[PDB]
Design a protein around this ligand. Structure first.
Ligand SMILES: [Zn+2]
Lengths: 98, 400, 53, 172, 298
């Protein structure tokens, strides 16, 4: 229910840059205007490829995911500890007088 | 006569109409007449399905000679019963296992060792152990074997399972069964040197309600001492919810062992020598040759570990002088086997005599980190999975 | 910059569709997993509810 | 590599064999389990070896001595023990294979822990003579020294299913 | 028709308004047909309200067995969650609005109470339970329209509950939801004093086909925004407050299960798993963008 907003906006601009793609392909194909400002931007794009190779964000994202993952680790804690407390309850229920 | 439809039961009438006879009451025989050879037509051929209840209660009136001379013949068809007729709920197959196989167990090192049953026979062993390599005294036999008998392979499959699901449930198990279980666990991960796993086995089983003391359990707590002190950089203190009389009775029985725990803080050769001579009765009581220099290893553990966070580099000749080390060249020798231990921040400077620390546990910078954590992932995953499953079954509790 | 123009724009179409299909396989893995999460927890909760009586 | 498969299959099958399996293949498995410098369950199974097998299979005693010097880690002595007895086609060839493998083990780890050493030291620690090591370092370009022979050893989808798992826990 | 429910039959609507089925059964209103104006400024004016509690008049109607929230939202005010009958003071809004709303054919009349507890809900607390109860003996059909802004921030779902509280004399019958909710110290005692004096309405939503097309087309260019969140940076501090709060709740679960708020240990395990899921899914979206745009290699 979140990523479908992603999907919707991406599909909208997808229609945009796909109409772009279509009249583009026609440029090199034929009967549609020959301009030098078509792909050229595509070259800019292919040098816009994966931003920050940098190892900077590489460490940064080690940071991020380690944070959330140890969060989840603690939550391996939360889940099984709640399970454990209920177990000790029922152990104090039938094995014992809670 | 005595097996008219009874052998017809095993062959034919097992998984049939009102034929629920043998399994439910849980062996080189099963009938002791002249026709002990006719004890071997078809019993370990097909399976051990729902033919459970009756005929064992019917036929517990013979109970003699469970060790007939079929040591290979009926042994052969029982290795079949392993393969061919492994069964339905094969826990109760511990019967012949109990009656015969421990019987057979008695002969194995009595001949050499378990020559002939282990490999195949684990087929119906695991047909027995339903899911988790579930606990039985088959563990007990074969793993006492792999501990002391020089045959450690067949449970290498079964090494670090969190096997569970034991059967009390009309016997089918014994206190000694788990006792042996984590016991050879301890001793083997000693010999196998995964000392932490076995130390774990000890403590997790020793908090069990305990009121009978055993010198067996004395060897248990002793070897646990061995690991927990040697294996660790200092002493462990445990969840003290173990026995009332046992854990607090052997605790003074651990007199020399608490004092030797103090000895772990002491660093004296002569005293540990004397105590080792004292307990040599245990040092070789089960071919456990080498425990003393296991202690000496813990000694140089303390040495090196102290040295670890001290400095970057010293006159390692002078450091060997420092650390009660027995040989400077020798010093780098065991240093470099620590390099084979793969842990040390040290380095090899013949010229300057330089050994530095290099403080690179991790630089948090790995797909390797990803692997560590994905391990953590799936581990904690299935952990919580059985959390929810056991919770689920707690939902199955009756009127309460 | 006289013309790789045709080949330029078509390599563009290529890689655009390539990242698109990577991300779309992701999309349907998502339509699996936490759609599978919907089904799994719904059924598991059905089990837990039927545990009572 | 196939040598490890040789180890594994020979071990498990030779175990499957016994009354008592092949004492020559016993010592062959000995070398096989040595292949990783796997010495301790090695001595373990040594202690299941029947004694006539040990003494009679003289290559068995030789290999046992070899693993002895292994625990010394005395490199040239162990090399010599390789050519003490020779079991070609199963051992002496794997003698060579394991020899070179653990020699490279020493290579890597020593170069790593290296700070300074006469290259001759470790060269004898890998059987390489003096100018054999000269070759090894110059061809490797590692700086050697006069009067010390000190080396310069140099030493050296994915996320989508992640997300699915994250939901399977978080969102369950 | 999809527009068949957008039809505000002022005739029919005000008919059931004067119908008084609640005085026959105070559980008649089971549904709550809503137009998304509630969500509209309820959401963004609880969030734009910061942490300042608010109050006032909702637009709406009634249909069959259904309260209908045509409107609900917030003020730039405070004091709600502790005001003696807060909501009243904002009704001046549609003391005017609805009036000349009729001048455009909005012949609707006032129906309810817009409000927001920015950060911690939209409801009526202890003094506002005086508010809620008094007014439902004042103003029935009256509702405790309940949705939490920051809960709907870190939750991804609109927990809407139209809480016709059980008037004095009328106890919760078979269907009293009584949505138990973690309250601050100010009003948790009075919630325990009044947690079981209200039920919820079956809050449905009604719209036009143009509405669906507009939301889809919204997404159809918002997806670019979707891959530009950076919200792990947003409320990591919020995660930290949950850190403290959760260690505290485990302290209190401790203190409860010691000798002998029901089973604070299990509730705490629940909420811990919840908030960790929250932070983890934030990290999910962020790692999503990251791995995507950073695995684009030339
Ligand atoms: Zn009030």
């Amino acid at each position: 229910e979140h990523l479908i907003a992603q999907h919707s906006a991406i599909k909208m601009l997808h229609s945009r840059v796909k109409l772009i793609l279509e009249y583009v392909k026609a440029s090199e194909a034929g009967e549609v205007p020959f301009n030098h400002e078509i792909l050229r931007e595509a070259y800019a794009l292919c040098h816009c490829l994966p931003v920050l190779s940098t190892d900077k964000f590489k460490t940064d994202f080690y940071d991020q995911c380690n944070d959330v993952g140890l969060m989840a680790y603690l939550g391996t804690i939360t889940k099984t500890c709640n399970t454990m407390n209920q177990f000790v309850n029922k152990f104090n229920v039938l094995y014992d007088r809670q | 006569s005595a097996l008219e439809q009874f052998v017809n039961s095993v062959r034919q009438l097992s998984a049939q109409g009102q034929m629920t006879q043998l399994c439910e009451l849980i062996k080189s025989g099963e009938l002791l007449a002249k026709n002990l050879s006719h004890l071997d037509t078809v019993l370990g051929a097909l399976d051990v399905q729902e033919h459970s209840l009756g005929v064992l209660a019917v036929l517990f009136v013979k109970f003699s000679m469970p060790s007939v001379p079929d040591f290979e013949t009926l042994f052969s068809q029982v290795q079949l019963f392993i393969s061919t007729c492994n069964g339905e709920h094969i826990r109760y197959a511990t019967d012949t296992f109990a009656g015969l196989c421990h019987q057979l167990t008695n002969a194995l090192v009595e001949r050499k060792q378990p020559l002939r049953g282990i490999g195949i026979l684990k087929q119906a062993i695991d047909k027995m152990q339903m899911n988790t390599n579930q606990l039985t005294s088959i563990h007990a036999d074969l793993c006492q074997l792999c501990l002391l008998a020089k045959c450690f392979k067949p449970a290498l499959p079964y090494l670090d399972v969190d096997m569970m699901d034991i059967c009390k449930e009309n016997g089918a198990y014994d206190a000694k069964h788990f006792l042996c279980y984590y016991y050879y666990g301890g001793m083997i991960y000693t010999g196998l040197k995964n000392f932490e796993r076995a130390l774990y086995f000890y403590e997790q089983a020793i908090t069990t309600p305990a009121m009978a003391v055993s010198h067996i359990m004395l060897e248990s707590y002793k070897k646990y001492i061995l690991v927990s002190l040697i294996l660790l950089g200092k002493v462990q203190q445990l969840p003290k919810y173990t026995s009332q009389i046992v854990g607090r009775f052997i605790k003074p029985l651990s007199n020399a062992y608490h004092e030797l725990a103090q000895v772990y803080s002491t660093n004296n050769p002569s005293e540990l020598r004397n105590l080792v001579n004292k307990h040599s009765e245990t040092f070789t009581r089960d071919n456990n040759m080498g425990l003393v220099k296991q202690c000496l290893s813990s000694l140089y553990k303390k040495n090196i570990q102290r040295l670890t966070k001290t400095f970057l580099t010293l006159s390692l000749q002078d450091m060997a002088s420092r650390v009660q080390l027995s040989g400077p060249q020798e010093a780098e020798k065991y240093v470099l086997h620590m390099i084979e231990d793969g842990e040390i921040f040290a380095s090899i400077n013949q010229k300057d005599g330089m050994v530095s620390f290099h403080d690179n546990p991790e630089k948090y910078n790995n797909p390797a980190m990803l692997h560590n954590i994905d391990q953590e992932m799936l581990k904690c995953i299935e952990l919580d999975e059985r959390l929810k499953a056991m919770d689920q079954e707690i939902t199955v509790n009756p009127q309460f | 910059r006289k013309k790789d123009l045709s080949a330029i724009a078509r390599t563009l179409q290529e890689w655009c569709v390539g990242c698109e299909v990577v991300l779309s396989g992701i999309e349907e893995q998502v339509s699996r997993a936490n759609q599978h999460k919907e089904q799994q927890l719904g059924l598991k909760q059905q089990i837990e509810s039927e545990v009572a009586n | 590599f196939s040598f490890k498969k040789l180890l594994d299959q020979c071990e498990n099958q030779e175990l499957e064999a016994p009354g008592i399996a092949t004492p020559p293949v016993y010592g062959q498995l000995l070398a096989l389990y040595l292949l990783h410098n796997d010495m301790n369950n090695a001595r373990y199974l040594w202690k299941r070896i029947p004694p006539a097998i040990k003494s009679a299979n003289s290559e068995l005693g030789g290999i046992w001595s070899v693993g002895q010097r292994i625990w010394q880690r005395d490199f040239p002595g162990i090399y010599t023990t390789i050519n003490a007895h020779q079991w070609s086609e199963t051992v002496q060839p794997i003698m060579e294979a394991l020899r070179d493998a653990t020699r490279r083990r020493a290579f890597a780890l020593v170069s790593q822990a290296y700070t300074s050493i006469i290259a001759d030291d470790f060269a004898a620690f890998v059987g390489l003579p003096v100018e054999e090591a000269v070759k090894g370092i110059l061809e490797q370009g590692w700086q050697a020294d006069s009067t010390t022979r000190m080396v310069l050893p140099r030493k050296p989808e994915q996320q989508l299913a992640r997300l699915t798992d994250y939901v399977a826990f978080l969102e369950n | 028709s999809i527009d068949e429910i957008y039809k505000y039959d002022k005739k029919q609507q005000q008919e059931i308004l004067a119908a008084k089925p609640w005085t026959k059964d105070h559980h008649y209103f089971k549904y709550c047909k809503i137009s998304a104006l509630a969500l509209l400024k309820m959401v963004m004016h609880a969030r734009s309200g910061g942490n300042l509690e608010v109050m006032g008049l909702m637009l709406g109607k009634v249909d069959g067995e259904t309260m209908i929230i045509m409107d609900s939202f917030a003020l730039p005010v405070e004091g709600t969650e502790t005001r003696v009958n807060a909501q009243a003071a904002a009704y001046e809004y549609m003391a005017a609005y609805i009036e000349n709303a009729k001048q455009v054919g909005r012949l609707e009349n006032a129906i309810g109470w817009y409000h927001s507890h920015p950060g911690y809900g939209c409801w009526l607390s202890g003094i506002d339970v005086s508010t809620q109860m008094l007014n439902q003996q004042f103003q029935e059909p009256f509702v405790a329209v309940v949705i939490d802004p920051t809960r709907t921030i870190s939750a991804g779902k609109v927990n809407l509950g139209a809480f016709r509280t059980y008037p004095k004399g009328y106890k919760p019958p078979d269907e009293g939801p009584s949505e138990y909710q973690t309250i601050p110290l100010n009003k948790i005692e009075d919630f325990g004093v009044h947690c079981k004096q209200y039920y919820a309405l079956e809050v449905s939503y009604f719209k036009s086909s143009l509405d669906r097309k507009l939301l889809e087309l919204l997404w159809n260019k918002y997806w670019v925004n979707t891959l530009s969140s950076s919200s792990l940076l947003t409320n990591a501090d919020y995660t930290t407050g949950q850190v403290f709060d959760l260690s505290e709740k485990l302290e209190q679960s401790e203190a409860q299960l010691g000798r002998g708020s029901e089973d604070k240990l299990a509730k705490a395990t629940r909420d811990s798993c919840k908030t960790t899921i929250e932070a983890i899914h934030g990290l999910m979206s962020q790692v999503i963008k990251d791995k995507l745009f950073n695995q684009i290699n030339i």
